[PDB]
Amino acid sequence: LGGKSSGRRQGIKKMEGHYVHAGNIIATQRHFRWHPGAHVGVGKNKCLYALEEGIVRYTKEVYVPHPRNTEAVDLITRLPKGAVLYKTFVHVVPAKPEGTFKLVAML
């Protein structure tokens, strides 16, 4: 016997060049098929979401793990002396500027 689990419907919900508002989920995954980049967050599922209004872009950026997170550090240590890991990152490149000074009155 065994289990028949339903499809999980995970993956990218927003592709490069899409206009993504603050809060929109960008990509859902188990493990990191993509990582959070500029203005992109991570939920408890590892799901990536936009932190600002703007455009999604994908990039392959050098990956440095946090010192406190042990396993990654170990892996890094293991690598040979000219090696760099690299990983894919999702950014939102913000469109509308946060601020505009308007004239209230002439006092």
Binding site: L75, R78, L79, P80, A83, L85, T88
Partner: protein, 95 residues
């Protein structure tokens, strides 16, 4: 992405008396490190007597000879069997 020219950019898996004796062992280890040889392991084996080990693998005859000479140049040695003298030490090889 697979079909993109940046395919395997993330790929990483493919890249990955007693006191005196102790001191001597340490020195030997250091020397090994310097000369670029695999130091596998070291032991703390049991008047009194005390033994120390420095397990080594892979070294060419000339280089090996040089290493031996340096080691020679106290206590004792034991690895052809190459013993010498000035607790105990035993640098077991695997050339």
């Amino acid at each position: 992405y697979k079909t993109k020219p940046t395919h395997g950019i993330g790929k990483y898996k493919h890249l990955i008396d007693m006191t005196l004796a102790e001191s001597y062992a340490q020195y030997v280890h250091n020397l090994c490190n310097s000369l670029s040889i695999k130091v596998e392991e070291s032991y703390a084996m049991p008047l009194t007597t005390h033994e120390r080990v420095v397990q080594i693998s892979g070294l060419s005859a000339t280089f090996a000879e040089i290493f031996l000479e340096i080691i020679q140049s106290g206590v004792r040695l034991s690895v052809x069997x190459x013993x010498x003298x000035x607790x105990x030490x035993x640098x077991x090889x695997x050339x």
